[PDB]
Design an enzyme around this catalytic site. Structure first.
Site, PDB file in Angstrom:
ATOM      1  N   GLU B 423     -12.616  -9.912 -13.192  1.00  0.00           N
ATOM      2  CA  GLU B 423     -12.236  -9.528 -11.835  1.00  0.00           C
ATOM      3  C   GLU B 423     -10.798  -9.007 -11.857  1.00  0.00           C
ATOM      4  O   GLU B 423      -9.918  -9.494 -11.149  1.00  0.00           O
ATOM      5  CB  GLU B 423     -12.392 -10.702 -10.868  1.00  0.00           C
ATOM      6  CG  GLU B 423     -11.946 -10.413  -9.442  1.00  0.00           C
ATOM      7  CD  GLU B 423     -12.149 -11.598  -8.518  1.00  0.00           C
ATOM      8  OE1 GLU B 423     -12.483 -12.694  -9.016  1.00  0.00           O
ATOM      9  OE2 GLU B 423     -11.980 -11.432  -7.292  1.00  0.00           O
ATOM     10  N   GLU B 432      -4.382  -2.503 -11.787  1.00  0.00           N
ATOM     11  CA  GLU B 432      -3.924  -3.707 -12.466  1.00  0.00           C
ATOM     12  C   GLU B 432      -4.155  -3.646 -13.967  1.00  0.00           C
ATOM     13  O   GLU B 432      -3.963  -4.653 -14.656  1.00  0.00           O
ATOM     14  CB  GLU B 432      -4.612  -4.940 -11.881  1.00  0.00           C
ATOM     15  CG  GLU B 432      -4.252  -5.180 -10.438  1.00  0.00           C
ATOM     16  CD  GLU B 432      -4.922  -6.400  -9.864  1.00  0.00           C
ATOM     17  OE1 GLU B 432      -5.747  -7.019 -10.567  1.00  0.00           O
ATOM     18  OE2 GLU B 432      -4.617  -6.738  -8.705  1.00  0.00           O
TER      19      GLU B 432
END
Ligand SMILES: Cn1ncc(-c2ccc3c(=O)[nH]nc(C[NH3+])c3c2)c1-c1c(F)c(Cl)cc(OC2CC2)c1C#N
Ligand SMILES: CSC[C@H]1O[C@@H](n2cnc3c(N)ncnc32)[C@H](O)[C@@H]1O
Lengths: 302, 625
Positions: B423, B432
């Site tokens: 995730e 990210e």
């Protein structure tokens, strides 16, 4: 000190209109201080004004008096700050000024009001950009016109044609109205117009002043730089060949002739000159009022 | 609960007026601080020497009342842009005088009109006033949806009204506002007081005000209708606009006199209340993020940074998100373990970035409902969260789960996984560095291993919002580039904005990445057909991801996972607003750049005009590897 008459009269004088017999009608507003209201006064002795203790009648209004005018000999039509048009009437004794009706139809300050030829209808102008035709008897708005795009500065009924009247606005329009036409407004060909005055002896002739101090004679062009500031009002004299009195925010009163030439100049006022009215008894006497609380009686050389 | 105010141009006495206003149900009052007709001279005698007082005394109200109940109004005779010089001088002095008296009273806001095209001098005086002491007082520019000239009755015989469509002409009032606030350099104290007319304009004229700092809506009593019972109401079209305005939580202002004299005056206000009560906000997601509307947030960097405890809590308060993971794992277990092998085939699952263990539990629940056997690894480099994992592992999970406190790129797995679950996605999908993390963990995935998610894609859409532009602009800091705030993205619940084109895909990544020459750098060109006149302030970002087959996660508005709270949109601002006409195309360029240390984005606008390249060499913003 008549009954139900305020002891003190507001400082800012806005309206001064003679009637047939010669009694003087005064409209005053409180434009500063704690309370912002107005009042109506009647001086059967014009020289006693604005002294409140020697007036014929008086009454207080809820808001200021932006403009007024006689309705016959005992009726007073008032343009209120509250957005309402008010009609007051003297009693049989002419010692009390009673409210006849007060209708809140405009959405902003009612700045101008004028009684039509028949004396049974009146037209009013407001900062809400609207112009309304009133049925004084039924106390209702017959028509509401939104022809302008800005504040309605002045509305002046025709002297003898009951369906015609002028109006000017800050949208730079001068509109000749004839409610007999499907489209009743017509744009008459500068600086913003601020005052209107029909000619009493010529049907299709009127004058209008602008925010730059110019007065112009217009046939449905002659003009002259009369004032150094806004021309607040224009009043023709009752003479056969009438004179033209112009008042302005420059604190001066001017008297012009047929060609807009200056015959008289008064600077007695120390503040704005708000109105001018000719005496029906003495045609050479001209009364003016202003925000300096002065009621000056001018003797105009003829 | 509607915050409403009463607009008046006539107040004989403040005490009595404010009382009648409050009793009718209003929260504040718009009134003049000087008499509207009290024209004042400042230069020429004798009028300039008019004895005082110039207006009412401040003692007539308490300080608290001036601060919270009164909204000042500029006198209507003040015309700084008059063509007569004398009137300009007096208006300038009168404007400063009235404005300064408003500040003297500490009024929370002041009303100034935009009733013509040229308000240059008006803006100069106001700007001058703004730079005379730092104050928080607001200035509400009163501007109509439709210019009065464009709604006058067609009753002038020799000057008929226009009957042909003037697309841009019908937007003139917006240009009034745009020019005024641009002259004022986008002052945060200058907001819009949009005035609604009896007849609404085209939708495009109304949409023009999307993203503008609308603080108040003004409703004249003359626009209300009258139902059978005789009470004031609004047309379904006006109700549509009132509903849109309630989403912006503007303050409504009632102006004009009472035209429904058969009913009392609180009637107009009651209708507003009534309308406010009659609306529907999507469960949670509009409850949820009502407080985060247009609130700028720094994008997380869960790799370079260790997330706090309550940040993981936010991740976990989204059951729909993880039940999607559970289903995705469920479907995968069945596809990899036939029914006849359900007792002999144990699948090696690896959560890469386990946080506090929501994916771990989701994996356990997935094996149960699938009736298959799994051996779990819980990888997490944030040691503080590994504390949560290992207390979970000892108290509940047991030997079935193996916690690994390591970076997935450096961890030497004892075996290879059948399924890696992660995730690591942000609002912009890969912002990210999920590609880099999964790439480094790829070596311990079986040759037939599945990665969940399997792929993700980021989407971009040009947006207009002078409000958000001002908030980014307000993010200047002492010891960095004075424009660095425009060269970095923000996670924000975009609210007061206007999306100028349909989102389009930007960057896509697939896992596993079987390709022999892995390069995560990207360069993408996008062309956005814009069918309106607007001003471009930035690009909104979303993402879509495929967990497995048809099970997906999405914050892209047209495919938004229904009921999912996680992930607000991201915002890429641009230094300078860009004017865009109807029919023009917005061409934007995006790069995903990287070195051995940092990954970052660079973007530029090439059409209709060229912007500067933003964040070159990650000078203002980088993502830590
Ligand atoms: C400010 N910001 N930036 C990124 C995120 C965020 C949000 C949710 C998830 C998630 O459910 N999974 N994985 C990730 C990362 N892989 C994640 C990342 C956020 C964020 C945040 F860090 C907090 Cl504490 C609160 C947030 O919004 C709440 C108020 C609605 C957001 C947002 N948006
Ligand atoms: C649920 S948000 C992303 C989670 O994965 C973790 N994470 C991010 N990158 C890595 C990595 N390279 N190795 C292990 N865990 C990671 C982060 O610490 C966070 O808990």
């Amino acid at each position: 000190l008549p009954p139900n008459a305020p002891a003190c009269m507001e400082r800012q004088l806005e309206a001064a209109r003679y009637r047939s017999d010669g009694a003087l009608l005064l409209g005053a507003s409180s434009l500063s201080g704690r309370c912002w209201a107005g009042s109506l006064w009647l001086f059967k002795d014009p020289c006693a004004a604005p002294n409140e203790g020697f007036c014929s009648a008086g009454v207080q209004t809820e808001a200021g008096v932006a403009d007024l005018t006689w309705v016959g000999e005992r009726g007073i039509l008032v343009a209120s700050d509250s957005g309402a048009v008010e009609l007051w009437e003297l009693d049989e004794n002419e010692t009390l000024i009673v409210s006849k009706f007060c209708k809140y139809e405009h959405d902003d300050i009612v700045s101008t009001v004028s009684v039509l030829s028949s004396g049974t209808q009146a037209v009013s102008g407001s900062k809400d950009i609207c112009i309304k035709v009133w049925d004084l008897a039924q106390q209702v708005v017959l028509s509401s016109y939104r022809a302008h795009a800005a504040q309605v500065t002045c509305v002046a009924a025709s002297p003898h044609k009951d369906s015609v009247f002028l109006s000017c606005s800050e949208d730079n329009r001068i509109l000749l109205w004839d409610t007999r036409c499907p489209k009743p407004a017509s744009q008459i060909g500068g600086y913003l117009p601020t005052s209107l005055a029909w000619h009493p002896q010529q049907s299709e002739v009127f004058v209008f002043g602008d925010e730059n101090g110019t007065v112009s004679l217009v046939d449905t062009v002659l003009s002259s730089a009369v004032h150094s500031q806004c021309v607040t009002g224009l009043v023709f004299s009752p003479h056969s060949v009438p004179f033209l009195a112009s008042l302005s925010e420059d604190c001066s009163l001017a008297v012009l002739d047929s060609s807009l030439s200056e015959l008289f100049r008064s600077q007695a006022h120390r503040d704005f000159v708000r109105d001018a009215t000719w005496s029906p008894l003495n045609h050479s006497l001209l009364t003016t009022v202003g925000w300096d609380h002065q009621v000056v009686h001018h003797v105009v050389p003829t | 609960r509607v915050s409403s105010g009463r607009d008046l141009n006539c107040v004989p006495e403040i005490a009595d007026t404010l009382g009648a206003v409050a009793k009718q149900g209003f929260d504040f009052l718009c009134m003049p601080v000087f008499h509207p007709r009290f024209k004042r001279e400042f230069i020429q005698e004798p009028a300039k020497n008019r004895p005082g007082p110039q207006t009412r005394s401040d003692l007539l109200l308490s300080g608290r009342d001036w601060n919270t109940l009164i909204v000042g109004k500029l006198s209507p005779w003040i015309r700084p842009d008059s063509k007569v010089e004398k009137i300009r001088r007096n208006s300038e002095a009168a404007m400063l005088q009235e404005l300064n008296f408003g500040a003297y009273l500490g009024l929370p806001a002041f009303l100034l009109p935009l009733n013509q095209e040229d308000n240059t001098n008006l803006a100069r005086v106001l700007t001058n006033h703004i730079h005379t002491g730092h104050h928080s007082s607001m200035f509400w520019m009163r501007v109509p949806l439709v210019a009065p000239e464009d709604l006058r009755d067609d009753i002038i015989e020799n000057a008929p009204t226009t009957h042909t469509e003037e697309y841009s002409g019908e937007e003139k009032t917006w240009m009034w506002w745009h020019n005024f606030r641009t002259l004022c350099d986008y002052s945060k104290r200058i907001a819009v007081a949009l005035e609604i007319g009896a007849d609404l304009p085209s939708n495009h004229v109304i949409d023009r005000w999307l993203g503008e700092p609308i603080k108040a809506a003004i409703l004249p009593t003359s626009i209300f209708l009258t139902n059978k019972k005789g009470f004031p109401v609004l047309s379904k079209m006006h109700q549509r606009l009132i509903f849109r305005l309630l989403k912006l939580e503007v303050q409504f202002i009632i102006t004009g006199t009472n035209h429904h004299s058969e009913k009392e005056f609180c009637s107009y206000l009651q209708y507003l209340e009534y309308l406010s009560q009659n609306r529907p906000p999507p469960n949670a997601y509009e409850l949820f993020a009502k407080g985060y509307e247009d609130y700028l947030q720094s994008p997380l960097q869960p790799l370079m940074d260790n997330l706090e405890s309550q940040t993981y809590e936010v991740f976990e308060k989204d059951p729909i998100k993880y039940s999607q993971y559970q289903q995705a794992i469920y479907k995968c277990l069945l596809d990899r373990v036939p029914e006849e092998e359900k007792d002999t085939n144990v699948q090696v699952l690896m959560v890469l970035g386990a946080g506090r263990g929501p994916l771990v539990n989701a994996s356990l629940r997935a094996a149960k409902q699938a009736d298959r056997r799994i051996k779990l690894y819980a990888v997490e480099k944030n040691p503080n969260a590994v504390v949560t994992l290992e207390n979970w592992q000892f108290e509940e999970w047991g030997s079935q789960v193996t916690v690994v406190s390591s970076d997935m790129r450096e961890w030497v797995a004892p075996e290879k996984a059948d399924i890696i679950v992660s995730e690591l996605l942000g609002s912009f999908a890969d912002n990210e560095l999920s590609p880099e993390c999964l790439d480094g963990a790829q070596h311990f995935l079986k040759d037939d291993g599945v990665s969940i998610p399997g792929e993700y894609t980021s989407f971009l859409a040009p947006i207009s919002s002078s409000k958000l532009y001002n908030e980014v602009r307000a993010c200047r800091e002492k010891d960095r580039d004075p424009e660095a705030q425009f060269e970095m993205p923000y996670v924000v619940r975009l609210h007061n904005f206007h999306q100028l084109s349909a989102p389009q895909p930007c960057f896509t990544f697939s896992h596993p990445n079987r390709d022999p020459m892995i390069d995560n750098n990207r360069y993408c060109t996008l062309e956005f057909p814009v069918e309106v006149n607007t001003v471009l302030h930035g690009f909104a970002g979303y993402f879509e991801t495929v967990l497995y087959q048809d099970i997906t996660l999405s914050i892209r508005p047209e495919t938004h996972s229904p009921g999912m709270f996680s992930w607000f949109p991201i915002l890429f601002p641009i230094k300078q607003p860009i004017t865009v006409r109807e029919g023009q195309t917005i061409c934007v360029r995006f790069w995903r750049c990287s070195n051995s240390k940092k990954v970052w984005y660079e973007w530029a606008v090439t059409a209709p005009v060229c912007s500067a390249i933003h964040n070159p060499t990650g000078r203002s913003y980088t993502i830590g590897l």
